Amino acid sequence: GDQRFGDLVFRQLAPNVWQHTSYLDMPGFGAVASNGLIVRDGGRVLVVDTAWTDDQTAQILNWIKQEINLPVALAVVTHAHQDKMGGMDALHAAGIATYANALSNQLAPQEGMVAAQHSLTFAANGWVEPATAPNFGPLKVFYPGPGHTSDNITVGIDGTDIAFGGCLIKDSKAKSLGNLGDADTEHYAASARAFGAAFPKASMIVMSHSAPDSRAAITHTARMADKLRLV
């Protein structure tokens, strides 16, 4: 079901949802996949996560313009690392309104990211304060607590069985939790379980670094995280 477009791969998940995949090329690293989402919300398109680079992100915009040809109303990025926020300048050059966790915007300069134009804040139960996420349509944004990073956020897509874990969630066969340099090893497992609880009807779990998985992804991530906590 994957389709190549330039150096990107797109996979349709639902009538109005596609996963975008881009691959990092510095000289020094493998071709590392990163996934995000494209959501058609009627007469506009919503983007979750940039690609690694501005150029790659501009390719995503060209795919959208060709294959959907509606205006991109907004992008939300799920934390301040390159694979999620590397393409902010391309979004801004295209005049797209960008949203991130307030904490992601505060971290951005230290991480080398361009901050999003707008800051999301969250209630104590983890749900985005809806004043800070105006006209998000089907995107249900949830901060599950610190895990992969302090600022990681997650997104459910209303009307579908899809929830997006970002880099918080790893696939049910993953051997490790990936990059833990910025991780909160005490709270990670609870944050993975909270994501599962926030979207209890989602049966397709989309994540940054593997194909869409079942809910087993969530329970396998929380286990690896608790193993890490107890060492």
Ligand X SMILES: CC1=C(S[C@@H]2CN[C@H](C(=O)N(C)C)C2)C(C(=O)O)=N[C@H]1[C@H](C(=O)O)[C@@H](C)O
Q: Kindly indicate which of the ranges 38-46, 63-71, 77-85, 118-126 contains the residues binding ligand X, using the contact rule CB under 6 A.
A: 77-85
Residue closer to ligand X (CB basis): 130 or 223 = 223
Identified binder of ligand X from the candidate list 41, 54, 83, 151, rule CB under 6 A: 83
Q: Which does 140 bind (CB under 5 to 8 A by kind): ligand X, Zn ion, none?
A: none
Nearer Cβ to ligand X, position 11 or 65?
11
- Residue 209 annotated as part of some ligand binding site: yes
CB atoms closer than 10 angstroms to residue 112: 11
Q: Does the annotation flag 83 for ligand binding? A: yes
Under the binding rule (CB under 5 A), the answer on residue 208 touching Zn ion is yes
Is residue 140 part of the contact set for ligand X (CB under 6 A)? no
Cβ(218)–Cβ(169) below 8 Å: yes
Six-digit token string for 213? 């998985």
The distance of closest approach from Cβ of residue 179 to Zn ion in the complex, given in angstroms and rounded to an integer, is: 6
In degrees to the nearest 10, what's the CA dihedral of 180, 165, 64, 112?
Answer: -30
35 binds Zn ion (CB under 5 A): no
CA dihedral 110, 7, 168, 202 (to 10 degrees): 140
What is the closest distance, in whole angstroms, from the C-beta atom of residue 88 to ligand X in the complex?
Answer: 13
Please tell me whether residue 185 binds ligand X under the rule CB under 6 A.
no
- The correct pick among 46, 61, 85, 167 for binding Zn ion (CB under 5 A) is 167
| Sole binder of Zn ion in the list 40, 81, 140, 193 (CB under 5 A) | 81
Pick from 124, 112, 109: which is nearest to 83 by CA?
112
**Alpha carbons 195 and 167: distance in angstroms, whole number:** 12
Distance CA 18, CA 206 (A): 11
Question: Contact region for Zn ion (CB under 5 A) — 16-24, 80-88, 156-164, 191-199?
Answer: 80-88
**Which positions ≥6 away from 74 have C-beta within 8 Å?**
46, 47, 96, 97, 98, 99, 135, 136
Our CA dihedral for 192, 196, 202, 208, rounded to 10 degrees, sits at -10
3-state secondary structure of 124: coil
32 binds, among Zn ion, ligand X, none (CB under 5 to 8 A by kind): ligand X
Q: How far is the CB of 98 from Zn ion (least distance, A)?
A: 17
Binding site for Zn ion (CB under 5 A): 81, 83, 167, 208
Binding site for ligand X (CB under 6 A): 32, 81-83, 148, 167, 178-179, 208-209
